Every structure is written in structure tokens, then in C-alpha cells.
Design a binder for this molecule. Structure first.
Ligand SMILES: *SCC1=CC(C)(C)N(O)C1(C)C
Length: 164
């Protein structure tokens, strides 16, 4: 397994616009289109992002293209972030995937704010890290997703995903 497969599990795949748990227009594999409440504005963001008049519908290949752009942006966001980079360097492969997952879902700045969790992760205090990670709006907004990611940070294995 790898970051792409991991995220594909967590985000799913939608070919039409839907709203995320924040009520924001999204499409494909967790691609946020805009925070605007206007569906029309969201449809235009989609056309802009895809490069054609989509009438609000994309193909699987288009979804995957947005996905590749998004994972790339998440990884670059971590590598250029003073708080995230050092931690990412210290992590093993599987745990690095969990970090990329968090950034993909809530952004570089939002994850960089998990100050205590990041400290515990850099110190390989996995049990403590897991507990600190749950002290967050994230743990409550998307519980099952946050649990899979947290459990991954604790075990350093793909077990939370392979079961599925
Ligand atoms: S849907 C029309 C539209 C609006 C804006 C975001 C300015 N565009 O890029 C297009 C041409 C998609």
C-alpha cells in the first residue's frame, strides 16, 4: 500500500459535486473546489480546474489527475514547512503517509498547528502522539477517518486499511 491507495480509501471517488463534512463543495477524490456557498461558483471552479465545460461531472481519469495534483501539493506543503518537514524526515514510510494524509485533508497550516502531536511524533512517543492527535476538531469532525490515520501513526502499519 502507499499514500495514493491510502487516501483513495479515505476520500472515496465521486464524479459529481458533493459537500464535505464542512458543507464545502467537493469532487472526485477529496478535491475541495471552493468554500463559497454558491454551487454555480463551484461549477465554474470545476471547469477552470478541469479545462472544459463539465456541466458539473468529471471522469475517473480527471478525478485521478486532480488527485495527483493534490497529493503532490500536500507533499510539497510538508517539505517547505518549518514545523512539518523535520517531523516528516524522522518518520518511517507508513507514518509519512499518515502525515501526508492529514495535510491533504486539512492543509499545511492546519496540520502544522498540531504542535504537541508533532513533538511526540518526532520523539517516536507513538502512544502519546495518538492521544494528542485526538485533542482536535478533526478527531470529532471526521472520526473514523481520523481513527484510521491515528492508529496508523501509532502502529506504523497499514492494518487500519488492509482490514477494509
Ligand atoms: S463557468 C465560467 C468561468 C468562470 C471562471 C472561474 C472565471 N472561468 O475560469 C470559467 C471560464 C470556467
Amino acid at each position: 500500500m502507499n499514500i495514493f491507495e491510502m487516501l483513495r480509501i479515505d476520500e472515496g471517488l465521486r464524479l459529481k459535486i458533493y459537500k464535505d463534512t464542512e458543507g464545502y463543495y467537493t469532487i472526485g477524490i477529496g478535491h475541495l473546489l471552493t468554500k463559497s456557498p454558491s454551487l454555480n461558483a463551484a461549477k465554474c471552479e470545476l471547469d477552470k480546474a478541469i479545462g472544459r465545460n463539465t456541466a458539473g461531472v468529471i471522469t475517473k481519469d480527471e478525478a485521478e489527475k486532480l488527485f495527483n495534483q493534490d497529493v503532490d501539493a500536500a507533499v510539497r506543503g510538508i517539505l517547505r514547512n518549518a514545523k512539518l518537514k523535520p517531523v516528516y524526515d524522522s518518520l518511517d514510510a507508513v507514518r509519512r503517509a499518515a502525515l501526508i494524509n492529514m495535510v491533504f485533508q486539512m492543509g499545511e497550516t492546519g496540520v502544522a498547528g498540531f504542535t504537541n502531536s508533532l513533538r511526540m511524533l518526532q520523539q517516536k512517543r507513538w502512544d502519546e502522539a495518538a492521544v494528542n492527535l485526538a485533542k482536535s476538531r478533526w478527531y470529532n469532525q471526521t472520526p473514523n477517518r481520523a481513527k484510521r490515520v491515528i492508529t496508523t501513526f501509532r502502529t506504523g502499519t497499514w492494518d487500519a486499511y488492509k482490514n477494509l
